[PDB]
Each structure stands twice: as structure tokens, then as C-alpha cells.
Amino acid sequence: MNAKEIVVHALRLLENGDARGWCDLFHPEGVLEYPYPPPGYKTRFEGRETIWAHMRLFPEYMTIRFTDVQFYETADPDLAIGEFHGDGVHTVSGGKLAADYISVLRTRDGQILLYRLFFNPLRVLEPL
Ligand SMILES: C[C@]12CC[C@H](O)C[C@H]1CC[C@@H]1[C@@H]2C[C@@H](O)[C@]2(C)[C@@H](C3=CC(=O)OC3)CC[C@]12O
């Protein structure tokens, strides 16, 4: 798949609570980044296993759906840059996360080398 197809397939996996499948999309040496992380969190997760250690916990703590996926037109199909919106619900709290993302994804042969995901960490600290 090209980068834009991988992005949309990745969002679909997360919406279904399938964090294992989402991590499976990364290259073994692939990198997840949160350039604007919530206080305390790392900004960079290197390697598929390190990413999985982090993401495996998500499905139990939160449910999410995405909307408004829009891509800017790049030159190379293995790069996608898109904005979208996520609406998460904390399972225990009932608290809600409403986030506008911008993402940069670099792919190589159907696997993710870089998934750079900008969001406003203030939306995380202020559930609704
Ligand atoms: C930073 C974050 C904040 C909510 C909660 O504390 C869990 C952490 C780790 C997990 C993290 C959320 C923020 C969320 O917006 C994420 C970035 C969200 C993602 C959206 C995305 O495309 O991939 C990941 C799913 C869950 C998420 O990966």
C-alpha cells in the first residue's frame, strides 16, 4: 500500500481496539513520535516492540473513532501528510478526548518507518 492507504488502514485498526494489528504495521525498526507529548511521556518510541509495550494498554483504557481525514498532496507515494480528528472515551472515567491531529507518515514497502503524530497535549489533560 502507499502511505495514505496505510494511514487510513491504521486508523481503522485503532477504532476496532486492534492495537496489535496497528503495531504490526510498523517496520521492526519503525519509530512512533509524539512531538507534543503529555507531561511525563516520551516523545519518541523506537522499534516495533517498544511501541507495542506502550500501545498494548490503549484498548482497555480508551475507545476511539476518527473523522475528517484529509491529505495534502505529496510528491512521493511513500510519504503521507494528513489531518484528522479523533474522539476518545476513557473507559473508567467516561472522560472524553477530542483531538485534531496532523500526521507525517513515512512508509517503505507497506510498513511504517516513521509515524509522527502531532496533537494538543492540553486536550489530554482536560477531559470533557
Ligand atoms: C497520549 C495518550 C493520551 C491519552 C492516554 O493517556 C493514552 C496516551 C497514550 C496513547 C495515545 C494517547 C493520545 C491519543 O491521541 C493517541 C495518540 C491516539 C492515536 C492516534 C493515532 O493515530 O495513533 C495513536 C491513540 C491513543 C494514543 O496513541
PDB file of C-alpha atoms and ligand atoms in Angstrom:
ATOM      1  CA  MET A   1       0.000   0.000   0.000  1.00  0.00           C
ATOM      2  CA  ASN A   2       1.040   3.656  -0.350  1.00  0.00           C
ATOM      3  CA  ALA A   3       1.384   5.955   2.686  1.00  0.00           C
ATOM      4  CA  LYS A   4      -2.127   7.422   2.512  1.00  0.00           C
ATOM      5  CA  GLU A   5      -3.655   3.922   2.343  1.00  0.00           C
ATOM      6  CA  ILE A   6      -1.626   2.760   5.342  1.00  0.00           C
ATOM      7  CA  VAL A   7      -2.752   5.813   7.391  1.00  0.00           C
ATOM      8  CA  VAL A   8      -6.437   5.034   6.784  1.00  0.00           C
ATOM      9  CA  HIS A   9      -5.912   1.304   7.428  1.00  0.00           C
ATOM     10  CA  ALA A  10      -4.111   2.225  10.677  1.00  0.00           C
ATOM     11  CA  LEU A  11      -6.927   4.474  11.901  1.00  0.00           C
ATOM     12  CA  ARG A  12      -9.413   1.682  11.144  1.00  0.00           C
ATOM     13  CA  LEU A  13      -7.410  -0.810  13.216  1.00  0.00           C
ATOM     14  CA  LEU A  14      -7.337   1.514  16.247  1.00  0.00           C
ATOM     15  CA  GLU A  15     -11.075   2.229  16.004  1.00  0.00           C
ATOM     16  CA  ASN A  16     -11.577  -1.514  16.431  1.00  0.00           C
ATOM     17  CA  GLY A  17      -9.404  -1.696  19.540  1.00  0.00           C
ATOM     18  CA  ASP A  18      -6.854  -3.686  17.496  1.00  0.00           C
ATOM     19  CA  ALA A  19      -3.614  -2.173  18.854  1.00  0.00           C
ATOM     20  CA  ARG A  20      -1.707  -5.365  17.989  1.00  0.00           C
ATOM     21  CA  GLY A  21      -2.623  -5.012  14.318  1.00  0.00           C
ATOM     22  CA  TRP A  22      -1.700  -1.311  14.392  1.00  0.00           C
ATOM     23  CA  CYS A  23       1.773  -2.089  15.794  1.00  0.00           C
ATOM     24  CA  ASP A  24       2.099  -4.863  13.198  1.00  0.00           C
ATOM     25  CA  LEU A  25       2.067  -2.132  10.538  1.00  0.00           C
ATOM     26  CA  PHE A  26       5.411  -0.774  11.776  1.00  0.00           C
ATOM     27  CA  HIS A  27       8.777  -1.889  10.476  1.00  0.00           C
ATOM     28  CA  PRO A  28      10.739  -3.691  13.220  1.00  0.00           C
ATOM     29  CA  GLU A  29      12.916  -0.582  13.349  1.00  0.00           C
ATOM     30  CA  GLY A  30       9.981   1.788  12.830  1.00  0.00           C
ATOM     31  CA  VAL A  31       9.521   4.857  15.010  1.00  0.00           C
ATOM     32  CA  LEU A  32       6.491   6.412  16.672  1.00  0.00           C
ATOM     33  CA  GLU A  33       6.790  10.050  17.711  1.00  0.00           C
ATOM     34  CA  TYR A  34       4.637  12.384  19.751  1.00  0.00           C
ATOM     35  CA  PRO A  35       6.301  15.753  19.142  1.00  0.00           C
ATOM     36  CA  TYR A  36       3.929  17.385  21.690  1.00  0.00           C
ATOM     37  CA  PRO A  37       3.596  14.696  24.343  1.00  0.00           C
ATOM     38  CA  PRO A  38       1.550  14.868  27.555  1.00  0.00           C
ATOM     39  CA  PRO A  39       3.782  15.768  30.532  1.00  0.00           C
ATOM     40  CA  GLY A  40       5.739  12.700  31.601  1.00  0.00           C
ATOM     41  CA  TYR A  41       5.511  10.852  28.273  1.00  0.00           C
ATOM     42  CA  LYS A  42       8.355  10.151  25.869  1.00  0.00           C
ATOM     43  CA  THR A  43       8.411  11.966  22.541  1.00  0.00           C
ATOM     44  CA  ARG A  44       9.973   9.090  20.627  1.00  0.00           C
ATOM     45  CA  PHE A  45       9.342   5.319  20.603  1.00  0.00           C
ATOM     46  CA  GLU A  46      11.967   3.399  18.655  1.00  0.00           C
ATOM     47  CA  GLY A  47      11.315  -0.097  17.311  1.00  0.00           C
ATOM     48  CA  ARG A  48       8.080  -2.082  16.968  1.00  0.00           C
ATOM     49  CA  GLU A  49       8.388  -3.845  20.337  1.00  0.00           C
ATOM     50  CA  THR A  50       8.915  -0.612  22.267  1.00  0.00           C
ATOM     51  CA  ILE A  51       5.868   0.856  20.534  1.00  0.00           C
ATOM     52  CA  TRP A  52       3.793  -2.225  21.343  1.00  0.00           C
ATOM     53  CA  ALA A  53       4.796  -2.030  25.031  1.00  0.00           C
ATOM     54  CA  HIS A  54       3.170   1.393  25.006  1.00  0.00           C
ATOM     55  CA  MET A  55       0.138   0.771  22.744  1.00  0.00           C
ATOM     56  CA  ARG A  56      -0.986  -2.637  24.024  1.00  0.00           C
ATOM     57  CA  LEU A  57      -2.503  -0.817  27.019  1.00  0.00           C
ATOM     58  CA  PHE A  58      -4.675   1.557  24.965  1.00  0.00           C
ATOM     59  CA  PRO A  59      -7.743  -0.631  24.090  1.00  0.00           C
ATOM     60  CA  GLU A  60      -8.518  -1.270  27.768  1.00  0.00           C
ATOM     61  CA  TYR A  61      -8.181   2.393  28.797  1.00  0.00           C
ATOM     62  CA  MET A  62      -9.933   4.005  25.833  1.00  0.00           C
ATOM     63  CA  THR A  63     -12.185   3.630  22.814  1.00  0.00           C
ATOM     64  CA  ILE A  64     -11.699   5.912  19.817  1.00  0.00           C
ATOM     65  CA  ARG A  65     -13.206   6.902  16.464  1.00  0.00           C
ATOM     66  CA  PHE A  66     -11.708   9.132  13.785  1.00  0.00           C
ATOM     67  CA  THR A  67     -13.248  11.503  11.255  1.00  0.00           C
ATOM     68  CA  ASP A  68     -12.432  14.248   8.719  1.00  0.00           C
ATOM     69  CA  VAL A  69      -9.349  12.539   7.235  1.00  0.00           C
ATOM     70  CA  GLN A  70      -7.742  14.940   4.730  1.00  0.00           C
ATOM     71  CA  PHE A  71      -4.373  14.598   2.976  1.00  0.00           C
ATOM     72  CA  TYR A  72      -2.068  17.219   1.485  1.00  0.00           C
ATOM     73  CA  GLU A  73      -0.729  16.183  -1.931  1.00  0.00           C
ATOM     74  CA  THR A  74       2.885  14.957  -1.744  1.00  0.00           C
ATOM     75  CA  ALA A  75       5.352  14.100  -4.495  1.00  0.00           C
ATOM     76  CA  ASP A  76       6.257  10.624  -3.226  1.00  0.00           C
ATOM     77  CA  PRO A  77       3.555   7.999  -2.520  1.00  0.00           C
ATOM     78  CA  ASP A  78       5.624   6.657   0.456  1.00  0.00           C
ATOM     79  CA  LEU A  79       5.045   9.897   2.340  1.00  0.00           C
ATOM     80  CA  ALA A  80       1.622  10.974   3.569  1.00  0.00           C
ATOM     81  CA  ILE A  81       0.762  14.149   5.435  1.00  0.00           C
ATOM     82  CA  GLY A  82      -2.823  14.397   6.618  1.00  0.00           C
ATOM     83  CA  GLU A  83      -5.007  15.976   9.229  1.00  0.00           C
ATOM     84  CA  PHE A  84      -7.858  14.201  11.005  1.00  0.00           C
ATOM     85  CA  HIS A  85      -9.920  14.255  14.181  1.00  0.00           C
ATOM     86  CA  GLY A  86     -10.115  11.696  16.962  1.00  0.00           C
ATOM     87  CA  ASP A  87     -12.784  11.265  19.638  1.00  0.00           C
ATOM     88  CA  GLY A  88     -11.722   9.040  22.501  1.00  0.00           C
ATOM     89  CA  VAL A  89     -13.624   7.860  25.549  1.00  0.00           C
ATOM     90  CA  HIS A  90     -11.856   6.867  28.756  1.00  0.00           C
ATOM     91  CA  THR A  91     -13.353   3.514  29.735  1.00  0.00           C
ATOM     92  CA  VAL A  92     -13.304   4.073  33.528  1.00  0.00           C
ATOM     93  CA  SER A  93     -13.685   7.856  33.754  1.00  0.00           C
ATOM     94  CA  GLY A  94     -16.229   8.259  30.972  1.00  0.00           C
ATOM     95  CA  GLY A  95     -13.991  11.238  30.233  1.00  0.00           C
ATOM     96  CA  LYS A  96     -13.622  12.307  26.621  1.00  0.00           C
ATOM     97  CA  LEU A  97     -10.673  13.291  24.426  1.00  0.00           C
ATOM     98  CA  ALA A  98     -11.358  15.444  21.384  1.00  0.00           C
ATOM     99  CA  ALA A  99      -8.232  15.868  19.309  1.00  0.00           C
ATOM    100  CA  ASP A 100      -7.233  17.427  15.999  1.00  0.00           C
ATOM    101  CA  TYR A 101      -4.178  15.645  14.627  1.00  0.00           C
ATOM    102  CA  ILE A 102      -1.638  16.333  11.970  1.00  0.00           C
ATOM    103  CA  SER A 103       0.471  13.354  10.999  1.00  0.00           C
ATOM    104  CA  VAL A 104       3.526  12.683   8.913  1.00  0.00           C
ATOM    105  CA  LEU A 105       4.000   9.089   7.844  1.00  0.00           C
ATOM    106  CA  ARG A 106       6.995   7.644   6.021  1.00  0.00           C
ATOM    107  CA  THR A 107       6.463   4.146   4.642  1.00  0.00           C
ATOM    108  CA  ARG A 108       8.666   1.562   2.992  1.00  0.00           C
ATOM    109  CA  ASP A 109       7.095  -1.382   1.164  1.00  0.00           C
ATOM    110  CA  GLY A 110       3.821  -1.439   3.079  1.00  0.00           C
ATOM    111  CA  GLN A 111       5.413  -0.923   6.523  1.00  0.00           C
ATOM    112  CA  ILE A 112       5.700   2.209   8.683  1.00  0.00           C
ATOM    113  CA  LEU A 113       9.192   3.663   9.245  1.00  0.00           C
ATOM    114  CA  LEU A 114       8.002   6.899  10.841  1.00  0.00           C
ATOM    115  CA  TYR A 115       4.640   7.844  12.314  1.00  0.00           C
ATOM    116  CA  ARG A 116       4.993  11.414  13.580  1.00  0.00           C
ATOM    117  CA  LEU A 117       1.791  12.395  15.329  1.00  0.00           C
ATOM    118  CA  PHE A 118       1.195  15.995  16.446  1.00  0.00           C
ATOM    119  CA  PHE A 119      -1.699  16.782  18.783  1.00  0.00           C
ATOM    120  CA  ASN A 120      -2.508  19.295  21.532  1.00  0.00           C
ATOM    121  CA  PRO A 121      -1.498  17.737  24.869  1.00  0.00           C
ATOM    122  CA  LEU A 122      -3.876  20.171  26.618  1.00  0.00           C
ATOM    123  CA  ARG A 123      -6.818  18.166  25.227  1.00  0.00           C
ATOM    124  CA  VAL A 124      -5.404  15.153  27.079  1.00  0.00           C
ATOM    125  CA  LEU A 125      -5.141  16.952  30.416  1.00  0.00           C
ATOM    126  CA  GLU A 126      -8.623  18.465  30.048  1.00  0.00           C
ATOM    127  CA  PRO A 127     -11.116  15.667  29.505  1.00  0.00           C
ATOM    128  CA  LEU A 128     -14.675  16.707  28.584  1.00  0.00           C
TER     129      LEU A 128
HETATM  130  C1  LIG B   1      -1.023  10.052  24.744  1.00  0.00           C
HETATM  131  C2  LIG B   1      -2.236   9.339  25.032  1.00  0.00           C
HETATM  132  C3  LIG B   1      -3.135  10.232  25.853  1.00  0.00           C
HETATM  133  C4  LIG B   1      -4.337   9.543  26.276  1.00  0.00           C
HETATM  134  C5  LIG B   1      -3.977   8.456  27.215  1.00  0.00           C
HETATM  135  O1  LIG B   1      -3.348   8.930  28.373  1.00  0.00           O
HETATM  136  C6  LIG B   1      -3.077   7.473  26.484  1.00  0.00           C
HETATM  137  C7  LIG B   1      -1.870   8.108  25.857  1.00  0.00           C
HETATM  138  C8  LIG B   1      -1.125   7.053  25.025  1.00  0.00           C
HETATM  139  C9  LIG B   1      -1.839   6.690  23.805  1.00  0.00           C
HETATM  140  C10 LIG B   1      -2.128   7.900  22.968  1.00  0.00           C
HETATM  141  C11 LIG B   1      -2.947   8.919  23.730  1.00  0.00           C
HETATM  142  C12 LIG B   1      -3.291  10.086  22.859  1.00  0.00           C
HETATM  143  C13 LIG B   1      -4.059   9.624  21.666  1.00  0.00           C
HETATM  144  O2  LIG B   1      -4.392  10.681  20.928  1.00  0.00           O
HETATM  145  C14 LIG B   1      -3.200   8.668  20.776  1.00  0.00           C
HETATM  146  C15 LIG B   1      -2.024   9.441  20.196  1.00  0.00           C
HETATM  147  C16 LIG B   1      -4.135   8.000  19.725  1.00  0.00           C
HETATM  148  C17 LIG B   1      -3.502   7.851  18.426  1.00  0.00           C
HETATM  149  C18 LIG B   1      -3.990   8.332  17.358  1.00  0.00           C
HETATM  150  C19 LIG B   1      -3.188   7.811  16.297  1.00  0.00           C
HETATM  151  O3  LIG B   1      -3.331   7.947  15.114  1.00  0.00           O
HETATM  152  O4  LIG B   1      -2.433   6.897  16.723  1.00  0.00           O
HETATM  153  C20 LIG B   1      -2.417   6.951  18.023  1.00  0.00           C
HETATM  154  C21 LIG B   1      -4.497   6.694  20.273  1.00  0.00           C
HETATM  155  C22 LIG B   1      -4.033   6.702  21.688  1.00  0.00           C
HETATM  156  C23 LIG B   1      -2.785   7.476  21.610  1.00  0.00           C
HETATM  157  O5  LIG B   1      -1.930   6.760  20.948  1.00  0.00           O
END
